[PDB]
Amino acid sequence: SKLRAVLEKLKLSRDDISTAAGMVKGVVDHLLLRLKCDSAFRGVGLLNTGSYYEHVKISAPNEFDVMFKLEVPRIQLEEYSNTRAYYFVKFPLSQFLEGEILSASKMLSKFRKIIKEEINDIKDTDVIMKRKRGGSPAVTLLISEKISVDITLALESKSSWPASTQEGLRIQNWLSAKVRKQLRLKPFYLVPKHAKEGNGFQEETWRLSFSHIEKEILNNHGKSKTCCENKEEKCCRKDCLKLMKYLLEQLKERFKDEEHLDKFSSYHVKTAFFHVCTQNPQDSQWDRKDLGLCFDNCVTYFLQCLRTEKLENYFIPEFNLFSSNLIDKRSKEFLTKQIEYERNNEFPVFDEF
Ligand SMILES: Nc1ncnc2c1ncn2[C@@H]1O[C@H](COP(=O)(O)OP(=O)(O)NP(=O)(O)O)[C@@H](O)[C@H]1O
Ligand SMILES: C[C@@H](C(=O)Nc1cc(Cl)cc(-c2ncc[nH]2)c1)N(C)C(=O)c1cccnc1C(=O)O
Ligand SMILES: [Mn+2]
Ligand SMILES: [Mn+2]
Ligand SMILES: [Zn+2]
């Protein structure tokens, strides 16, 4: 009942949703219209993604994610240095070429410059652009000093997914082989997040994103097509993800003056959650009346990922989110220590008083 009380606190206010939805749509639709007036971005379209649109945003509707997608015909990908997730793109767009290479940094720079200029002309609403966030492919706005919106430029390809995904998306026993085939016929996206190059970055490179598929999975998440559509099939999958997100969010807030938790994000618990869904494919393994055990399942799986330093990207199995190339052993051991403490003491970080 403690966890149910936490979930109640984490629910979004209907009034907050109403106000935030109206503000975000108005700003983003406006910016989409304006971007379409530039010769480079004339074909851009909108794709809403991330936790708000997955219905697993917690506490307040104060952070939205949207892709501004662009279909570039005759796209040719080249994997960057066996990184599995990062690619060169080979091809109004000549302004972004460096050779035959379509430079991710050049496109993102112009994207940001246009948005910056357009929000300066917005006089009816309080809209500012936040300082660049290291390693982010997004341009981030703050509306009314309270609502953050991450706008990510994304190249769209309707080609077959890259070979690094061949063994990913292992949903056959959970969501079915038919659905896996259907999802892999959808487009994929490249976002301007650059591969590491020594102490710097390979500024021409793009990164694969399957944020849209993650949304498809979370909003059609049951083995039963009617999971969570009736009183007899309410599962606790989304509640477990919300609780894992809150656990990480609260620990990051508490330990914010440490650096050890700075490299963890909600995508780590999202990825681990998808793996637990693969391991537990039946809706009967996610019964509402088993919330406590299901959440403990999720926590101990995440702990094992930290201990083994293994957290495969759900779509790209050879991309290890917990590689020591990305996160120090010391940082993973530190997070392990804090989560173990929370588990062993019935999650005091969840308590308001
Ligand atoms: N490390 C990553 N690798 C791949 N995709 C990522 C990564 N981080 C974020 N994304 C994608 O970008 C989306 C938006 O990121 P973010 O706003 O951090 O997460 P979120 O899922 O919306 N959770 P939150 O906003 O904390 O409630 C995620 O849902 C992912 O699809
Ligand atoms: C680490 C970094 C990052 O790598 N994000 C990322 C990586 C990839 Cl590969 C794809 C996409 C994507 N695909 C579609 C839309 N966005 C995003 N990050 C998590 C953020 O900057 C961040 C921080 C706080 C809140 N929100 C975000 C955010 O990203 O929304
Ligand atoms: Mn988000
Ligand atoms: Mn975001
Ligand atoms: Zn369900």
Backbone φ and ψ for 125, nearest 5 degrees, come out as -145, 145
| 40 located within any domain | yes
Can you say which residues are annotated as belonging to the binding site for Mg(2+)?
63, 65, 150
The string of DSSP letters for 248-317 reads: HHHHHHHTTTSSTTTT--HHHHHHHHHHHHHHS-SGGGGBGGGHHHHHHHHHHHHHHHHHHT--B-SS-T
Clarify whether residues 16 and 37 are in a common domain.
yes
Clarify whether residues 154 and 230 are in a common domain.
no
* Domain endpoint, select from 178, 210, 242: 210
Clarify whether residues 18 and 51 are in a common domain.
yes
298 within 8 A of 277, measured Cβ to Cβ: no
The string of DSSP letters for 201-238 reads: EETT-EEEE-HHHHHHHHTS--SSTTTTSSGGG-BSHH
* Domain endpoint, select from 175, 210, 245: 210
Query: Is the beta carbon of 214 within 6 A of some atom in ligand 1?
Result: yes
Distance 65 CA to ligand 4 centre (A): 5
Instruction: List % helix, strand, coil for the chain (3-state, nearest 5).
Output: 45, 20, 40
| 2 located within any domain | no
Query: Is the beta carbon of 265 within 6 A of some atom in ligand 1?
Result: yes
Any idea what the CATH number is for the domain that residue 312 is in? 1.10.1410.40
Give the list of residues 6+ apart from residue 22 with CB closer than 8 angstroms, or none.
none
Any idea what the CATH number is for the domain that residue 103 is in? 3.30.460.90
Q: Which two tokens stand for residue 113?
A: 């410059």
Clarify whether residues 85 and 227 are in a common domain.
no
Q: Which two tokens stand for residue 34?
A: 């304006």
Relative to the CA of 267, which ligand 1 atom is closest? 8
Backbone φ and ψ for 267, nearest 5 degrees, come out as -70, -25
Resolution in A, one decimal? 1.6
Relative to the CA of 249, which ligand 1 atom is closest? 26
Q: Which two tokens stand for residue 160?
A: 């077959």
Can you say which residues are annotated as belonging to the binding site?
49, 51, 63-65, 150, 193, 207-214, 221, 227-228, 235, 245, 266-270
Clarify whether residues 142 and 230 are in a common domain.
no
Method of determination is: X-ray
| 182 located within any domain | no
The total number of structural domains in the chain stands at: 2
CB atoms within 10 A of CB 302: 24
The string of DSSP letters for 301-343 reads: HHHHHHHHT--B-SS-TT-BTT-TTTS-HHHHHHHHHHHHHHH
Rounded CA-CA distance 202/305 in Å is 29
Relative to the CA of 51, which ligand 1 atom is closest? 22
Q: Report the half-sphere exposure of 315 (CA within 13 A, side-chain side).
A: 19
**Structural domain that includes position 293:** 221-353
Clarify whether residues 197 and 228 are in a common domain.
no
| 18 located within any domain | yes
Pocket of ligand 2 (CB under 6 A): 49, 65, 67, 133, 135-138, 150, 152, 191, 193, 207, 209, 211, 265, 267
Clarify whether residues 229 and 304 are in a common domain.
yes
Q: Report the half-sphere exposure of 51 (CA within 13 A, side-chain side).
A: 23
16 within 8 A of 60, measured Cβ to Cβ: yes
| 238 located within any domain | yes
* Domain endpoint, select from 210, 244, 273: 210
Clarify whether residues 346 and 240 are in a common domain.
yes
Q: Scan for tokens 């959808």, then name that residue.
A: 186
Query: Is the beta carbon of 267 within 6 A of some atom in ligand 1?
Result: yes
Clarify whether residues 114 and 201 are in a common domain.
yes
| 170 located within any domain | no
| 100 located within any domain | yes
- Three-class SS string for 53-67? HHCCCCCCCCEEEEE
Pairing status of strand 188-191 against strand 206-209: antiparallel
Can you say which residues are annotated as belonging to the binding site for ATP?
51, 63-65, 211-214, 245, 266-270
Clarify whether residues 252 and 206 are in a common domain.
no
Clarify whether residues 147 and 29 are in a common domain.
yes
By CB neighbour count within 10 A (0-12 exposed, 13-18 middle, 19+ buried), where does 135 fall?
A: exposed
For ligand 2, atom 5, name the residue with the nearest CA: 136
**Number of residues that this document lists for the chain:** 353
| 184 located within any domain | no
CB atoms within 10 A of CB 33: 11
For ligand 2, atom 24, name the residue with the nearest CA: 265
Query: Is the beta carbon of 266 within 6 A of some atom in ligand 1?
Result: yes
* 67, 169, 271, 274, 348 from 214: Cα distances, Å: 14, 10, 10, 9, 30
Can you say which residues are annotated as belonging to the binding site for GTP?
49, 150, 207-214
241 within 8 A of 273, measured Cβ to Cβ: yes
Rounded CA-CA distance 32/37 in Å is 9
Rounded CA-CA distance 1/4 in Å is 5
Clarify whether residues 199 and 267 are in a common domain.
no
